[PDB]
Design an enzyme around this catalytic site. Sequence first.
Site, PDB file in Angstrom:
ATOM      1  N   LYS A   1      -6.036   8.842   6.949  1.00  0.00           N
ATOM      2  CA  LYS A   1      -4.918   9.481   6.267  1.00  0.00           C
ATOM      3  C   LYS A   1      -5.221  10.942   6.007  1.00  0.00           C
ATOM      4  O   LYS A   1      -4.369  11.805   6.195  1.00  0.00           O
ATOM      5  CB  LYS A   1      -4.575   8.731   4.973  1.00  0.00           C
ATOM      6  CG  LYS A   1      -3.889   7.381   5.224  1.00  0.00           C
ATOM      7  CD  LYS A   1      -3.462   6.696   3.925  1.00  0.00           C
ATOM      8  CE  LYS A   1      -2.591   5.463   4.183  1.00  0.00           C
ATOM      9  NZ  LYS A   1      -3.290   4.448   5.034  1.00  0.00           N
TER      10      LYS A   1
ATOM     11  N   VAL B   1      10.223   5.692 -16.917  1.00  0.00           N
ATOM     12  CA  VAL B   1      10.608   5.416 -18.300  1.00  0.00           C
ATOM     13  C   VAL B   1       9.529   4.577 -18.992  1.00  0.00           C
ATOM     14  O   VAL B   1       9.134   3.540 -18.475  1.00  0.00           O
ATOM     15  CB  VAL B   1      11.954   4.643 -18.364  1.00  0.00           C
ATOM     16  CG1 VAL B   1      12.413   4.473 -19.820  1.00  0.00           C
ATOM     17  CG2 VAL B   1      13.012   5.348 -17.540  1.00  0.00           C
TER      18      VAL B   1
ATOM     19  N   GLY C   1      -1.149  14.996 -22.287  1.00  0.00           N
ATOM     20  CA  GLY C   1       0.096  14.272 -22.086  1.00  0.00           C
ATOM     21  C   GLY C   1       0.616  13.653 -23.375  1.00  0.00           C
ATOM     22  O   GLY C   1       1.821  13.517 -23.568  1.00  0.00           O
TER      23      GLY C   1
END
Length: 326
Positions: free
Chosen positions: A63, A94, A180
């Site tokens: 990859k 959500v 965060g």
Amino acid sequence: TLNGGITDMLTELANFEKNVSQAIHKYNAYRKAASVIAKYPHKIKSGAEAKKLPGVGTKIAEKIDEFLATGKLRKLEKIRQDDTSSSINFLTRVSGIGPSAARKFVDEGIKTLEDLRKNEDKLNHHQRIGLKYFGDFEKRIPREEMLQMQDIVLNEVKKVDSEYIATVCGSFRRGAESSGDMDVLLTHPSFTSESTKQPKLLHQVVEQLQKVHFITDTLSKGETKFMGVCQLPSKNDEKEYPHRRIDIRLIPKDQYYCGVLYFTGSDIFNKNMRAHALEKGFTINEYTIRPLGVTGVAGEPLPVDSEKDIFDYIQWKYREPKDRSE
DNA sequence: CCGACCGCGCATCAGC
DNA sequence: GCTGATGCGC
DNA sequence: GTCGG
Ligand SMILES: Nc1nc2c(ncn2[C@H]2C[C@H](O)[C@@H](COP(=O)(O)OP(=O)(O)[C@@H](Cl)P(=O)(O)O)O2)c(=O)[nH]1
Ligand SMILES: [Cl-]
Ligand SMILES: [Cl-]
Ligand SMILES: [Cl-]
Ligand SMILES: [Cl-]
Ligand SMILES: [Cl-]
Ligand SMILES: [Mg+2]
Ligand code: NA
Ligand code: NA
Ligand code: NA
């Protein structure tokens, strides 16, 4: 950002596996590879070079070769064009909606923010608050705001009982310039591994923080774990601060070091450290480190007087919190 | 080749 | 009610 | 998906 393109690709692949494929071990495999590549101090020139790192195997190496040649990955380009995969990935953003609920909502024809807002009665309490602050929860918190929040939490906790200790953990404790959310470890002498001498230790603190309008919403709440929503106060005429996620964890006072090690993370760091523990014949949780017996049964908690004692048991050199951001 | 892949709190649900 | 399994998030 | 044994 040195190998940012590669790490972003692996993370997108990780998210696909977790959210759409519901393949948690592939999810972890990609996260592990992204993490190892993120800390590698060279700009990666080939998949073969990458494959030298633990966690990067044959498939990720291919990859990386595709990505380096073309600037992208066909597997991902197709995933992005898949409406069902796109829809599930969105919904899982959500708070409270995971892989299962997301796919269930899609089955029911619920697949956008607009659909969610008009089907609010199909959401549990957690999901409803996640929807309400959907935009806010994706915004990061500048360390400056984290410092203001810490100041409120520490002072308010002090007003309740001067014997509480609250410690901000998470990426904040690892010295990050943004976070965060806010993670608060809480102790009080009344609550130890031996006895709980006062009830409502967590509740009292949550109450005070709601009383001063710092905590605004609750996602979940039990005797030792609070997960909810908070907001810094704003000034006259000034725009309101975004609402933020806050978790508060009440840990036995004698079990602080295991608790602070746990809540400091990162989550990948904890996985790596716990896996290493197992190889050394120990098991680590947020409470204790225990030896594993000659069959595999956890034994008695080993004595711990610092975070470094835990590192010492598993024969790791000590890493400061700033060096735990994996 | 192949299990093993960190460890757990709270909410919610099925089954008794 | 309870236990236990699952989802979700940490 | 990766790896140890
Ligand atoms: N053992 C374990 N610990 C975990 C796991 N997930 C989280 N923790 C522990 C370690 C985490 O450090 C801590 C808080 O979890 P946040 O998800 O808030 O992670 P951070 O604070 O690091 C940053 Cl992502 P920021 O919030 O600033 O954006 O909980 C897990 O899956 N396993
Ligand atoms: Cl898997
Ligand atoms: Cl891509
Ligand atoms: Cl401890
Ligand atoms: Cl324990
Ligand atoms: Cl540090
Ligand atoms: Mg955090
Ligand atoms: Na490798
Ligand atoms: Na979610
Ligand atoms: Na958190």
